[PDB]
Design a protein around this motif. Structure first.
Motif, PDB file in Angstrom:
ATOM      1  N   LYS A   1       0.865  -1.212   0.000  1.00  0.00           N
ATOM      2  CA  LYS A   1       0.000   0.000   0.000  1.00  0.00           C
ATOM      3  C   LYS A   1       0.872   1.222   0.000  1.00  0.00           C
ATOM      4  O   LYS A   1       1.904   1.238   0.645  1.00  0.00           O
ATOM      5  N   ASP A   2       0.450   2.250  -0.713  1.00  0.00           N
ATOM      6  CA  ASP A   2       1.271   3.449  -0.883  1.00  0.00           C
ATOM      7  C   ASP A   2       0.365   4.640  -1.139  1.00  0.00           C
ATOM      8  O   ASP A   2      -0.815   4.499  -1.476  1.00  0.00           O
ATOM      9  N   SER A   4      -0.728   8.377  -2.910  1.00  0.00           N
ATOM     10  CA  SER A   4      -0.800   9.146  -4.151  1.00  0.00           C
ATOM     11  C   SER A   4      -1.431  10.492  -3.840  1.00  0.00           C
ATOM     12  O   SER A   4      -2.255  10.584  -2.924  1.00  0.00           O
ATOM     13  N   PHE A   5      -1.106  11.513  -4.624  1.00  0.00           N
ATOM     14  CA  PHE A   5      -1.717  12.834  -4.503  1.00  0.00           C
ATOM     15  C   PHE A   5      -2.077  13.303  -5.908  1.00  0.00           C
ATOM     16  O   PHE A   5      -1.203  13.553  -6.730  1.00  0.00           O
TER      17      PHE A   5
ATOM     18  N   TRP B   3      -4.976  13.270  -1.151  1.00  0.00           N
ATOM     19  CA  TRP B   3      -4.213  12.085  -0.851  1.00  0.00           C
ATOM     20  C   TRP B   3      -5.086  10.849  -0.798  1.00  0.00           C
ATOM     21  O   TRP B   3      -6.190  10.875  -0.255  1.00  0.00           O
ATOM     22  N   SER B   4      -4.541   9.742  -1.325  1.00  0.00           N
ATOM     23  CA  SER B   4      -5.141   8.414  -1.234  1.00  0.00           C
ATOM     24  C   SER B   4      -4.074   7.419  -0.802  1.00  0.00           C
ATOM     25  O   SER B   4      -2.895   7.619  -1.078  1.00  0.00           O
ATOM     26  N   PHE B   5      -4.503   6.338  -0.156  1.00  0.00           N
ATOM     27  CA  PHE B   5      -3.617   5.260   0.277  1.00  0.00           C
ATOM     28  C   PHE B   5      -4.262   3.946  -0.112  1.00  0.00           C
ATOM     29  O   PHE B   5      -5.355   3.623   0.350  1.00  0.00           O
ATOM     30  N   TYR B   6      -3.604   3.189  -0.974  1.00  0.00           N
ATOM     31  CA  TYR B   6      -4.126   1.910  -1.406  1.00  0.00           C
ATOM     32  C   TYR B   6      -3.051   1.072  -2.056  1.00  0.00           C
ATOM     33  O   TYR B   6      -1.918   1.572  -2.237  1.00  0.00           O
TER      34      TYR B   6
END
Ligand code: NA
Lengths: 6, 6
Positions: A1-2, A4-5, B3-6
């Motif tokens: 999991k990481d 992103s923007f 921001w997202s985290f996945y």
């Protein structure tokens, strides 16, 4: 999991 | 944009 923007 | 985290 990481991060992103967009 | 945000921001997202996945
Ligand atoms: Na990251």
């Amino acid at each position: 999991k990481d991060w992103s923007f967009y």
